[model samples]
Target: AVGIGALFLGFLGAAGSTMGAASMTLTVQA
Candidate 1:
């Protein structure tokens, strides 16, 4: 069994021209 995770940055349209954001992902195996 094992576990993993990650984080990333991205863009988002809220106010003004545009904006950025962060994301994450997880996984498990045996």
Candidate 2:
């Protein structure tokens, strides 16, 4: 269970980083 939780958290962190990177790109474009 703990390993699964960690994996889920890591996935969320990756998604958050992806969104942050996208936001930065849009900000620069704008």
Candidate 3:
């Protein structure tokens, strides 16, 4: 369940058009 939720959250992050969300993911990984 946790793995599936993570995948869904990742998909949500990637599906956004706003540059802010993309940058947020980058910052998270960094």
Candidate 4:
């Protein structure tokens, strides 16, 4: 159960970071 929670949190963090990075890229390009 603890492992599953950690995995879920990690996935969310990765997704958030990826989205932030993509946004920055688009802003710079524009």
Best by lDDT: 4
* Tens digit per residue, CA lDDT, model 2, 1-30: 587799789778988787777765745752
Best by TM-score: 2
lDDT of 3 by residue, 1-30 (tens): 587899778778866656566676755752
Q: lDDT tens string, model 1, 1-30?
A: 233222212222243233222222234331
Which sections of candidate 4 miss by over 4 Å? 1-3, 25-30
* Colliding residue pairs in candidate 3: none
- Candidate 2 residue 9 C-alpha distance from true site, Å: 0.5
- Residues 1-30 of candidate 4 have per-residue lDDT tens digits of 587899789778988887777766755752
Alpha-carbon lDDT, every model = 0.27, 0.74, 0.69, 0.75
Q: Model 2: residues >4 Å from true position, as ranges?
A: 1-3, 25-30
Instruction: Report lDDT (Cα) of residue 6, candidate 3.
Output: 92
The TM-score of candidate 2 is 0.47
| Residue 15 lDDT in candidate 3 | 61
lDDT computed for candidate 2: 0.74
Query: Number of backbone collisions per candidate, in order?
Result: 0, 0, 0, 0
Q: Each model's TM-score, in the order given?
A: 0.10, 0.47, 0.32, 0.46
Scored by lDDT, model 4 comes in at: 0.75
RMSD of 1: 16.7
Clash-forming residue pairs, model 1: none
